[PDB]
mmCIF file with all atom_site columns, N, CA and C in Angstrom:
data_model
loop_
_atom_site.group_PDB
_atom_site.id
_atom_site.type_symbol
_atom_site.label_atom_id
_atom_site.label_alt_id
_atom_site.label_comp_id
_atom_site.label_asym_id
_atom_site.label_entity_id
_atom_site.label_seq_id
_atom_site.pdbx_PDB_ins_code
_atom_site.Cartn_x
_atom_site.Cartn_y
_atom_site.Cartn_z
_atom_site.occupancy
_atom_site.B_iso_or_equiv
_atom_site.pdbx_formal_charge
_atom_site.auth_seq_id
_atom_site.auth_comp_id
_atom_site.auth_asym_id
_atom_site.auth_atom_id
_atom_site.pdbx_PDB_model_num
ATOM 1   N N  . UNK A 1 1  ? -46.613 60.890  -25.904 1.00 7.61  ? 28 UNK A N  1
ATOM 2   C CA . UNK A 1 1  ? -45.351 61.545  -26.197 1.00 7.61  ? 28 UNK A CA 1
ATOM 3   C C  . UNK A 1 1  ? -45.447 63.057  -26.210 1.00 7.61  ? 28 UNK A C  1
ATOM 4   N N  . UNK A 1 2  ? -44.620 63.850  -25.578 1.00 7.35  ? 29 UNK A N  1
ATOM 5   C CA . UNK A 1 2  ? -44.605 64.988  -25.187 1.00 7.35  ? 29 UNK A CA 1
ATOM 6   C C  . UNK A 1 2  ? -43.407 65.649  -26.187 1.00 7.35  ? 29 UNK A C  1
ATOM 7   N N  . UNK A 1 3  ? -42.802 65.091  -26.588 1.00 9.00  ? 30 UNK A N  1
ATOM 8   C CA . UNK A 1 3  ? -42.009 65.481  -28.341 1.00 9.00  ? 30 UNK A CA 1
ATOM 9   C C  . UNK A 1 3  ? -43.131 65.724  -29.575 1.00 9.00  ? 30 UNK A C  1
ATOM 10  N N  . UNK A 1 4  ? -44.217 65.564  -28.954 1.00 9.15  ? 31 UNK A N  1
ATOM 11  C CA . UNK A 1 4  ? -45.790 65.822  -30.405 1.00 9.15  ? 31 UNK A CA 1
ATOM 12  C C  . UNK A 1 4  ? -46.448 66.561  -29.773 1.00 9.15  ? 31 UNK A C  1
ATOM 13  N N  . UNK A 1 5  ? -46.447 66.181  -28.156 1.00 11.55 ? 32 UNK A N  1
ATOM 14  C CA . UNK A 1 5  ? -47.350 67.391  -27.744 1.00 11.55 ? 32 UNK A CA 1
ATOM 15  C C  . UNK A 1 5  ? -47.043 68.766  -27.814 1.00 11.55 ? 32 UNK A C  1
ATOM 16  N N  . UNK A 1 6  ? -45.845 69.102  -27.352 1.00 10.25 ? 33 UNK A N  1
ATOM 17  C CA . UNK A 1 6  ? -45.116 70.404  -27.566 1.00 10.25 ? 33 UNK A CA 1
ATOM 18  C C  . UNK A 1 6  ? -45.435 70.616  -28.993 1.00 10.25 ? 33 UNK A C  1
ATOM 19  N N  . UNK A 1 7  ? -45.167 69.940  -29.540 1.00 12.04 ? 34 UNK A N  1
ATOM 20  C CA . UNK A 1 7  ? -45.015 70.587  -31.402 1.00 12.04 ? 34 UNK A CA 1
ATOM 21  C C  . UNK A 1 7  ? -46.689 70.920  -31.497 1.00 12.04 ? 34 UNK A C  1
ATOM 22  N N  . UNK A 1 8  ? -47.059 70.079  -31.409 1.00 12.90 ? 35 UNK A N  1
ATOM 23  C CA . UNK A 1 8  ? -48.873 70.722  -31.466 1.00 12.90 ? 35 UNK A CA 1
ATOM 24  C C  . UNK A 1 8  ? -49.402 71.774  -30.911 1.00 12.90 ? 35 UNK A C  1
ATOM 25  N N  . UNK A 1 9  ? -49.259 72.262  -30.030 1.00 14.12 ? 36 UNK A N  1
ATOM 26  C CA . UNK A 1 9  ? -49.544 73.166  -29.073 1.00 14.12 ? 36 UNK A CA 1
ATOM 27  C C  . UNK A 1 9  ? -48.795 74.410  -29.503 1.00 14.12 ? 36 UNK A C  1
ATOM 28  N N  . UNK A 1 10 ? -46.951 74.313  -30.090 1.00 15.93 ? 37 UNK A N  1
ATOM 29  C CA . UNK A 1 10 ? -46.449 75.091  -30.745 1.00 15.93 ? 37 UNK A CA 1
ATOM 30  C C  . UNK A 1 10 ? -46.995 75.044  -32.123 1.00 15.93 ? 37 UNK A C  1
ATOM 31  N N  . UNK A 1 11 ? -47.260 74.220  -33.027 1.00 14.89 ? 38 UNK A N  1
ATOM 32  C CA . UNK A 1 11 ? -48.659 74.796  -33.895 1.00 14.89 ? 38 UNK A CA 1
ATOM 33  C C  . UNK A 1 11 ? -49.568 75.445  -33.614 1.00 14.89 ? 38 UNK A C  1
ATOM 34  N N  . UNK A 1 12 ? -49.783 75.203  -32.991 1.00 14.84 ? 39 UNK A N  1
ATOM 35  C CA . UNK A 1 12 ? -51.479 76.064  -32.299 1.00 14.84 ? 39 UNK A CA 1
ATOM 36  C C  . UNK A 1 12 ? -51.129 77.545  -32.017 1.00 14.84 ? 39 UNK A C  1
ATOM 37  N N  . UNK A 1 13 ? -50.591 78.088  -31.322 1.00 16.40 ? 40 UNK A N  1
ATOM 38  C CA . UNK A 1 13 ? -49.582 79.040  -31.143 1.00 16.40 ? 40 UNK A CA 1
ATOM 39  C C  . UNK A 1 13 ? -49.086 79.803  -32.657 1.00 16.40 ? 40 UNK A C  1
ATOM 40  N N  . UNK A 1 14 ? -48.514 79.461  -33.263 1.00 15.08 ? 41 UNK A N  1
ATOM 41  C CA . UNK A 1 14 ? -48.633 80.068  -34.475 1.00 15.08 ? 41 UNK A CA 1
ATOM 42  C C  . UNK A 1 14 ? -49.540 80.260  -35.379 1.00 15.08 ? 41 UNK A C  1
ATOM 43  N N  . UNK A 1 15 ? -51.012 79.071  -35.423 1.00 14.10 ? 42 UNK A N  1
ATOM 44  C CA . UNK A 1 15 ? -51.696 79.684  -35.867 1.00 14.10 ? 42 UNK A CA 1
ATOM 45  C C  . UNK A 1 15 ? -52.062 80.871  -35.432 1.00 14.10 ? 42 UNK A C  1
ATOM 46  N N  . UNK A 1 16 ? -52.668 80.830  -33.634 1.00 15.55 ? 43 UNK A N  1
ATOM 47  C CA . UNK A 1 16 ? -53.310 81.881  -33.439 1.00 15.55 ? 43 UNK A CA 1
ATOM 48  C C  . UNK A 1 16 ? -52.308 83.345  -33.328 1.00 15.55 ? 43 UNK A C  1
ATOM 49  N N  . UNK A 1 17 ? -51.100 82.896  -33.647 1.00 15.83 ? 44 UNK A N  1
ATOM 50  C CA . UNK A 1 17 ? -50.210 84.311  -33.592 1.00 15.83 ? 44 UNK A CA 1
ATOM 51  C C  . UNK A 1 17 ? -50.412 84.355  -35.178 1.00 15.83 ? 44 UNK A C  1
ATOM 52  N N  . UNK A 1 18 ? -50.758 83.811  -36.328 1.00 18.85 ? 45 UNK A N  1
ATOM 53  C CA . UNK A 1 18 ? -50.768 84.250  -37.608 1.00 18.85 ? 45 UNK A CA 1
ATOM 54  C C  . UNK A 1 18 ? -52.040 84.745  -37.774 1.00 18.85 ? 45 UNK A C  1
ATOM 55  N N  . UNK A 1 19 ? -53.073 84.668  -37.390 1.00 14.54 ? 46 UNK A N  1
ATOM 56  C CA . UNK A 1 19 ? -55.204 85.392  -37.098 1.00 14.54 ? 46 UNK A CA 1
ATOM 57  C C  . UNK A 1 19 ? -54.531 86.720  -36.258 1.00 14.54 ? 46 UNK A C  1
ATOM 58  N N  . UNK A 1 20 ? -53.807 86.811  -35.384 1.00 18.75 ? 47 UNK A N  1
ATOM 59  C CA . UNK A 1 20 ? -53.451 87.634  -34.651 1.00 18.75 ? 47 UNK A CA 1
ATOM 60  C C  . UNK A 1 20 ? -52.597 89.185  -35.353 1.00 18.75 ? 47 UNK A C  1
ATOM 61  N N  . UNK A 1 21 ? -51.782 88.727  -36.082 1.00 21.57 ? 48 UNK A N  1
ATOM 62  C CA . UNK A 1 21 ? -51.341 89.475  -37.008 1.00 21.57 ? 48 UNK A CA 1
ATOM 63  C C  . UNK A 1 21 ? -51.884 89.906  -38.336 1.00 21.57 ? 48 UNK A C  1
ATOM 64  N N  . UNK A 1 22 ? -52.559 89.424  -38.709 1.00 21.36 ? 49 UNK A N  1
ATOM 65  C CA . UNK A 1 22 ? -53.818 89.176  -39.652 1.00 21.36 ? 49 UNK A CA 1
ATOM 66  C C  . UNK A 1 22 ? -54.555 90.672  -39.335 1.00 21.36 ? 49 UNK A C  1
ATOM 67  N N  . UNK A 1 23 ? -55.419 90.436  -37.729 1.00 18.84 ? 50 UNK A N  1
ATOM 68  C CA . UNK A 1 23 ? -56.075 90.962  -37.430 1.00 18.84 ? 50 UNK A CA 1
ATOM 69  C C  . UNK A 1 23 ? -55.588 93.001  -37.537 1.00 18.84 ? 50 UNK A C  1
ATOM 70  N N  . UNK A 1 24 ? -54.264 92.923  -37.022 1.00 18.14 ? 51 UNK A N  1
ATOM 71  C CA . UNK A 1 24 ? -53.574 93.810  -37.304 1.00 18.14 ? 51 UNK A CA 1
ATOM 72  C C  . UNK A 1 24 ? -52.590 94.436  -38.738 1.00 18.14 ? 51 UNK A C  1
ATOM 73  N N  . UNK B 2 1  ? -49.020 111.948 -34.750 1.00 15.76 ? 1  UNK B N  1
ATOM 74  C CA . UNK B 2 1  ? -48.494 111.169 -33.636 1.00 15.76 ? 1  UNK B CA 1
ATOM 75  C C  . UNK B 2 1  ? -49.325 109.805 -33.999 1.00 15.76 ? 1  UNK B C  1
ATOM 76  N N  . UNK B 2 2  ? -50.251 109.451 -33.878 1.00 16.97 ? 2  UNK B N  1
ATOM 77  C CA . UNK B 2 2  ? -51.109 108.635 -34.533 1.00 16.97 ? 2  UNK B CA 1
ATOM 78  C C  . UNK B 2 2  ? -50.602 107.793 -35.901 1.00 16.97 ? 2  UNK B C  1
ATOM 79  N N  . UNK B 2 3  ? -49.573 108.690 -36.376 1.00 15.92 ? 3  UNK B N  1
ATOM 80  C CA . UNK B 2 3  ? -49.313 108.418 -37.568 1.00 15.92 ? 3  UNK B CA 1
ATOM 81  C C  . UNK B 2 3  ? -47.540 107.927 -37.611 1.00 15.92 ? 3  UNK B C  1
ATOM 82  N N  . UNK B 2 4  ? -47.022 108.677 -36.372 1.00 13.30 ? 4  UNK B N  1
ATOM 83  C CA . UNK B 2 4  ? -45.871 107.706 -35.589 1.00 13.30 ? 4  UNK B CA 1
ATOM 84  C C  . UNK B 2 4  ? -46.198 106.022 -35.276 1.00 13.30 ? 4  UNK B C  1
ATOM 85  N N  . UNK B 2 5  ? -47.302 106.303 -34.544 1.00 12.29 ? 5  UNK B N  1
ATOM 86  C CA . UNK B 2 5  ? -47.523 104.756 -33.883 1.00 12.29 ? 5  UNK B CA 1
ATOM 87  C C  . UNK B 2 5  ? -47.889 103.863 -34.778 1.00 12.29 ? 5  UNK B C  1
ATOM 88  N N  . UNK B 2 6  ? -48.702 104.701 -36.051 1.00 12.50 ? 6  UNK B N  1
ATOM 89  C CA . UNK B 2 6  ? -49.023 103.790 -37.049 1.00 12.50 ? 6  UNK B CA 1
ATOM 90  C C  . UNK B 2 6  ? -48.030 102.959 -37.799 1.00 12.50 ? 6  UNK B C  1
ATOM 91  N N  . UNK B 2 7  ? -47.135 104.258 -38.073 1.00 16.97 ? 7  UNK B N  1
ATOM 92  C CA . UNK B 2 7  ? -45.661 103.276 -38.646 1.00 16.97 ? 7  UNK B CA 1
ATOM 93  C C  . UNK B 2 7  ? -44.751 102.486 -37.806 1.00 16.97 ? 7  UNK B C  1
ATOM 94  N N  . UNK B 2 8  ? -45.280 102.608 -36.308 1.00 18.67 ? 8  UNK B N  1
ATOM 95  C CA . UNK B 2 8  ? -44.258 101.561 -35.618 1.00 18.67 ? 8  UNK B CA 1
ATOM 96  C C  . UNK B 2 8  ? -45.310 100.250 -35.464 1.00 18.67 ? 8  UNK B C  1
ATOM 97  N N  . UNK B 2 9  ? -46.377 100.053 -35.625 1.00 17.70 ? 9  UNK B N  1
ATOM 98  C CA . UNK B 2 9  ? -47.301 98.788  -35.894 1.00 17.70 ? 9  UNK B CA 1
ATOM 99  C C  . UNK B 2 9  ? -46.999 98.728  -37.071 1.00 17.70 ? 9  UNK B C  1
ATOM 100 N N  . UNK B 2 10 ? -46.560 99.105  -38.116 1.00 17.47 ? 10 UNK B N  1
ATOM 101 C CA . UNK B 2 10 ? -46.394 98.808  -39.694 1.00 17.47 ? 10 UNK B CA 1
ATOM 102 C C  . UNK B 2 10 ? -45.281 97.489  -39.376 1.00 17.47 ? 10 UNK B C  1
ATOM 103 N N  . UNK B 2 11 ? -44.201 98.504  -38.807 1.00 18.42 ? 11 UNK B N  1
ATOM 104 C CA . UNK B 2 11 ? -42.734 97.790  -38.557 1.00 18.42 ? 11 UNK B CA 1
ATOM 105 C C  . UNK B 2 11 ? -43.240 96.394  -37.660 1.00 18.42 ? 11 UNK B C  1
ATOM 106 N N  . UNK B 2 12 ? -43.596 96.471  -36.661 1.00 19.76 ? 12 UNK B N  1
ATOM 107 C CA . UNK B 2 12 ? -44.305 95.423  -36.142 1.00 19.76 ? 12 UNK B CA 1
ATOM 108 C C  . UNK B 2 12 ? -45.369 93.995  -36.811 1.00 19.76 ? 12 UNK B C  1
ATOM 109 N N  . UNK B 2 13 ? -46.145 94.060  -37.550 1.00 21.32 ? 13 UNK B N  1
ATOM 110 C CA . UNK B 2 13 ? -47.111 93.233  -37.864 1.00 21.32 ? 13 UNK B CA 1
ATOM 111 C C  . UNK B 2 13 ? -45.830 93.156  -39.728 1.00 21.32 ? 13 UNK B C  1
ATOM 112 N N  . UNK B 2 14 ? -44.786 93.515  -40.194 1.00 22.74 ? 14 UNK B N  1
ATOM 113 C CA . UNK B 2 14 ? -44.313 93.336  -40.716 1.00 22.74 ? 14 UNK B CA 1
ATOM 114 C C  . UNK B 2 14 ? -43.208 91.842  -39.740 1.00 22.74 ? 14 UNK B C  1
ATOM 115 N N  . UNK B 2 15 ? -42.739 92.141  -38.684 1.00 24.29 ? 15 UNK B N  1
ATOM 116 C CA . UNK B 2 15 ? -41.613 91.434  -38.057 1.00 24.29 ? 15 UNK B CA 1
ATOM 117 C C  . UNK B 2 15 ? -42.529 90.350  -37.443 1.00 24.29 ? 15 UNK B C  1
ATOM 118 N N  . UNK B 2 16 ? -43.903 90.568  -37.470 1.00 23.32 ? 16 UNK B N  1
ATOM 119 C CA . UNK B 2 16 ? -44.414 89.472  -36.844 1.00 23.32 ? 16 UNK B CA 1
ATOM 120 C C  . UNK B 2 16 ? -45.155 87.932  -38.262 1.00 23.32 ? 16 UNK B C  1
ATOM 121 N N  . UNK B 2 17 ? -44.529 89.032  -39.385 1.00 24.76 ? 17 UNK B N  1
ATOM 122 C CA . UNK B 2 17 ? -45.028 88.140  -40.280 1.00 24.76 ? 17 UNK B CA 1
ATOM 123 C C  . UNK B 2 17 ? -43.383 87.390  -40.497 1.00 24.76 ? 17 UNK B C  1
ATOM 124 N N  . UNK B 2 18 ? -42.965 88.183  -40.341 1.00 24.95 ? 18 UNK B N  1
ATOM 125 C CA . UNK B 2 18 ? -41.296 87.284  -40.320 1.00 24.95 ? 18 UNK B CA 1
ATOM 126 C C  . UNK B 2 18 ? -40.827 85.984  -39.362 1.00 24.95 ? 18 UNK B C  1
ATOM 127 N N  . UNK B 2 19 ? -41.245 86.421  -38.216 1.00 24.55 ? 19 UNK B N  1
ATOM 128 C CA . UNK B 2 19 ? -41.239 85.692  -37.048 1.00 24.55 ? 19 UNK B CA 1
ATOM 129 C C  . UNK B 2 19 ? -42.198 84.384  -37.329 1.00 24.55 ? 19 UNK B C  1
ATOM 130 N N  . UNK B 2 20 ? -43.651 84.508  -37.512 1.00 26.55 ? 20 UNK B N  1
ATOM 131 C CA . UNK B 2 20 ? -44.504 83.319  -38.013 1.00 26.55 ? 20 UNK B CA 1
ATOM 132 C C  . UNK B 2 20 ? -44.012 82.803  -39.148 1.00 26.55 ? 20 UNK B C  1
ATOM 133 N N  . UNK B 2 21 ? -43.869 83.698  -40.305 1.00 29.05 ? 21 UNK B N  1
ATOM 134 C CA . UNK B 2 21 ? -42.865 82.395  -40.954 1.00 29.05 ? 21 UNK B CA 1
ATOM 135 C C  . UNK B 2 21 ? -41.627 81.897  -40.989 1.00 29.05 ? 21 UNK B C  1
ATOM 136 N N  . UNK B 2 22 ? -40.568 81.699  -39.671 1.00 27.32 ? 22 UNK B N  1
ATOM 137 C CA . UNK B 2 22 ? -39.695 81.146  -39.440 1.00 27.32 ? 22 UNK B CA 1
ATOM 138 C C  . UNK B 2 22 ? -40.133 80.023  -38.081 1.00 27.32 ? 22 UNK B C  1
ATOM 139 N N  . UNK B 2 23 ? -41.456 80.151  -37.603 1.00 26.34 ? 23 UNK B N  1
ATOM 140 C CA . UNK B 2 23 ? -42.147 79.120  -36.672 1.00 26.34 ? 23 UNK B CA 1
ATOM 141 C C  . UNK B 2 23 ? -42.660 78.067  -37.588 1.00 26.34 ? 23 UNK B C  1
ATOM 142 N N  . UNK C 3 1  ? -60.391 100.066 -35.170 1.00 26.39 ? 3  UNK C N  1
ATOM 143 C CA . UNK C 3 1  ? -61.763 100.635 -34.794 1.00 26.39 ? 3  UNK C CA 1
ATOM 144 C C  . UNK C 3 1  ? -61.814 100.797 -33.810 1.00 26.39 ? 3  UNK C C  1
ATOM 145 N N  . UNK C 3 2  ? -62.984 100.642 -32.907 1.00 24.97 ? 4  UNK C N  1
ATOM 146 C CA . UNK C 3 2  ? -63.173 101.111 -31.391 1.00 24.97 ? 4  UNK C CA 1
ATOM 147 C C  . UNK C 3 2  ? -61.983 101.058 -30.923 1.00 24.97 ? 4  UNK C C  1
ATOM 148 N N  . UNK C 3 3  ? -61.319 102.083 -29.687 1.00 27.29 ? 5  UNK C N  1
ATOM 149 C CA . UNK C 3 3  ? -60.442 101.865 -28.895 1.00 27.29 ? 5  UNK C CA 1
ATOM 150 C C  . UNK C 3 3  ? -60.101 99.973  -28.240 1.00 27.29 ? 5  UNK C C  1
ATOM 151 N N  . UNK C 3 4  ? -60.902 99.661  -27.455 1.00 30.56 ? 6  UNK C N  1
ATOM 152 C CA . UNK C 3 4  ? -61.404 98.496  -26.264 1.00 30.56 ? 6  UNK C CA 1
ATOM 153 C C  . UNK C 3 4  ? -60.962 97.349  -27.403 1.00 30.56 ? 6  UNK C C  1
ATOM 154 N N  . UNK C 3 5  ? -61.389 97.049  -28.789 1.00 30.57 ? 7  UNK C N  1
ATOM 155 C CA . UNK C 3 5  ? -60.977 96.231  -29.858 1.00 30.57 ? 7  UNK C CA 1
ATOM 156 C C  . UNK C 3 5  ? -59.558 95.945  -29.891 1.00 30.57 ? 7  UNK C C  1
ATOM 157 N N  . UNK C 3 6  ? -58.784 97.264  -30.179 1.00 31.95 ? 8  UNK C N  1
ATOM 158 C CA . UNK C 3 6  ? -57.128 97.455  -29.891 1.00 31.95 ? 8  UNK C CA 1
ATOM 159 C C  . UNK C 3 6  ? -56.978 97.180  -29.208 1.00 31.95 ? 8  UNK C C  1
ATOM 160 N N  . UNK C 3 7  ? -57.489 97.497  -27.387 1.00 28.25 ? 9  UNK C N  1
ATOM 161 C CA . UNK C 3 7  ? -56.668 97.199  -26.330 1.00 28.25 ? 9  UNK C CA 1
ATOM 162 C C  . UNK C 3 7  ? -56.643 95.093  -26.148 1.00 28.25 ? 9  UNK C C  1
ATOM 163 N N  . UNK C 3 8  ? -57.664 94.772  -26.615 1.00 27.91 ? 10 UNK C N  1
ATOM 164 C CA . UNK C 3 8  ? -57.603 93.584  -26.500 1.00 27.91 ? 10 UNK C CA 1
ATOM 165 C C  . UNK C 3 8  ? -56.833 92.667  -27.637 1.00 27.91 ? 10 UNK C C  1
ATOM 166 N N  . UNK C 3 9  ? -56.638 93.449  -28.580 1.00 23.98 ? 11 UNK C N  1
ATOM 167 C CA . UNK C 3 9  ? -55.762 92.288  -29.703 1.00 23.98 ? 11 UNK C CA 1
ATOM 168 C C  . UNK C 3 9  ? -53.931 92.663  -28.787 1.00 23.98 ? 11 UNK C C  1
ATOM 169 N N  . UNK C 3 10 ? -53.770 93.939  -28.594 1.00 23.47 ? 12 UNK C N  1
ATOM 170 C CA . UNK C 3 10 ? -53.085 94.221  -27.793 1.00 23.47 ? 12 UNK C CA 1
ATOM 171 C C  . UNK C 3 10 ? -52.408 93.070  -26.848 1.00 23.47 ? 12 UNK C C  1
ATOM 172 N N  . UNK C 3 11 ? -53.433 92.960  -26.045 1.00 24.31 ? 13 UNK C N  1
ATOM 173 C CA . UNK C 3 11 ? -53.479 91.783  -24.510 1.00 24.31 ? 13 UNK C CA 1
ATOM 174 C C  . UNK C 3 11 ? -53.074 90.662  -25.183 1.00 24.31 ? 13 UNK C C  1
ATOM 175 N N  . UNK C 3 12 ? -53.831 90.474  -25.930 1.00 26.84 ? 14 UNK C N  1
ATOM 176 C CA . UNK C 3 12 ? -53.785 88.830  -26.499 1.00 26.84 ? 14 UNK C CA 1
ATOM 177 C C  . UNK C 3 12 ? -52.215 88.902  -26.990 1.00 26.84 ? 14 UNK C C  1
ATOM 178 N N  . UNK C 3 13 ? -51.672 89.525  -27.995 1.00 24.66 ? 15 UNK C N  1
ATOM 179 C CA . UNK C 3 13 ? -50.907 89.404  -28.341 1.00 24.66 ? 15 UNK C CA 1
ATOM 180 C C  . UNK C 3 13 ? -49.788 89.233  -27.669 1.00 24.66 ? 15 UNK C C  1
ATOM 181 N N  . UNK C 3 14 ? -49.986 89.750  -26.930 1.00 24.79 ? 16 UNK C N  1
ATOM 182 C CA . UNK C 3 14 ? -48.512 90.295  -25.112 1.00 24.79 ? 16 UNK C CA 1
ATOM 183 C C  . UNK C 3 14 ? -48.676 88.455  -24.757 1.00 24.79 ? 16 UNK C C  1
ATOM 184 N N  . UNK C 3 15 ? -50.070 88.375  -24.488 1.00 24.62 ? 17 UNK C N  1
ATOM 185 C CA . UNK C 3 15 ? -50.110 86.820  -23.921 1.00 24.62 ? 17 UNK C CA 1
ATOM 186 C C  . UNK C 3 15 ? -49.448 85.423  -24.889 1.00 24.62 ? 17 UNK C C  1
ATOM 187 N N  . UNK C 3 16 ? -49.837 85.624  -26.018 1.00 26.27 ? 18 UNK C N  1
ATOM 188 C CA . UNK C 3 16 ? -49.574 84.876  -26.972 1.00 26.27 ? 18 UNK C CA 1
ATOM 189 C C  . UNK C 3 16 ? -48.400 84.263  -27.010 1.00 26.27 ? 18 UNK C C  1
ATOM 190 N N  . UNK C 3 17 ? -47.522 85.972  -27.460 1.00 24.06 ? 19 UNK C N  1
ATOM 191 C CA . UNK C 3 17 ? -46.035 85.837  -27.541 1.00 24.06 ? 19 UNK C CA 1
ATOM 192 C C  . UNK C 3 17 ? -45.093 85.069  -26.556 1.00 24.06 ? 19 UNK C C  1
ATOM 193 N N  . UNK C 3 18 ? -45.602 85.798  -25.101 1.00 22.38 ? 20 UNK C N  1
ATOM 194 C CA . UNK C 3 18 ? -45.631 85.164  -24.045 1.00 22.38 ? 20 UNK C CA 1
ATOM 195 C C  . UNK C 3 18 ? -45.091 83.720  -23.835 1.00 22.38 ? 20 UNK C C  1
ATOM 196 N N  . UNK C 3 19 ? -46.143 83.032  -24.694 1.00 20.45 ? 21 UNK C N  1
ATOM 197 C CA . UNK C 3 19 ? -46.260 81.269  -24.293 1.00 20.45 ? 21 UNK C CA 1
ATOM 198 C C  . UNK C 3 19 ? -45.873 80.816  -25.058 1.00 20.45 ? 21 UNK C C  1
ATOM 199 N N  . UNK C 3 20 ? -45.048 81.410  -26.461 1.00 18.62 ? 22 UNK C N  1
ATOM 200 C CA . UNK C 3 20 ? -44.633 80.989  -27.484 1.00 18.62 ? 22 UNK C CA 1
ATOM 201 C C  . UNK C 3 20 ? -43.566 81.013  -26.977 1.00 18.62 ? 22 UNK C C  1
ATOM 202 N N  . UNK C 3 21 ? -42.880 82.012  -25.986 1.00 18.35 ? 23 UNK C N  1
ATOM 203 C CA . UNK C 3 21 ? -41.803 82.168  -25.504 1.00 18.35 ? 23 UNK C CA 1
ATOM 204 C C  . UNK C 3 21 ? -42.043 81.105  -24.198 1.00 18.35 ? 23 UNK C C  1
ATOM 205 N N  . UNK C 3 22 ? -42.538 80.422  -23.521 1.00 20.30 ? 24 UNK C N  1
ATOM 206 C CA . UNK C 3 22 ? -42.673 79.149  -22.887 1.00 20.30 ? 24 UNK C CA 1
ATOM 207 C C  . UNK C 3 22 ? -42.091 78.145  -23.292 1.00 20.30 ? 24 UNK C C  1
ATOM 208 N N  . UNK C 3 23 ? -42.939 77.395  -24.705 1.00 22.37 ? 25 UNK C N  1
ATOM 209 C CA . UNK C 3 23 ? -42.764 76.942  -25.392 1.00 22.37 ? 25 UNK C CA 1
ATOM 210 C C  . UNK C 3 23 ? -41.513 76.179  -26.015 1.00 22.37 ? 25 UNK C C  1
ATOM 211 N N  . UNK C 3 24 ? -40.907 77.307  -26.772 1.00 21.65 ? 26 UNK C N  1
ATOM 212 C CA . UNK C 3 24 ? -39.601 77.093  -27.433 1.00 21.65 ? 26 UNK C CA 1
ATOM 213 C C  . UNK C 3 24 ? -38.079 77.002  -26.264 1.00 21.65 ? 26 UNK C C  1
#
């Protein structure tokens, strides 16, 4: 199912945009 | 000038904490 | 710190946003 995959991947994505902002 | 850009990354990594927590 | 440090959280970030903007 690609209705979980999107959402996961858009998790993933915010983590690394929240380390990202972090960083800054 | 340094200190321009600094406050426009302030404004920035402020809107990006806004933005992540509405994701 | 170093210049090259910035330019790359920089990149990443441009990319990031990017695919978040894919994404949604």
């Amino acid at each position: 199912g690609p209705m979980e995959e999107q959402r996961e991947i858009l998790e993933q994505l915010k983590k690394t945009l929240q380390m990202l902002t972090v960083e800054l």
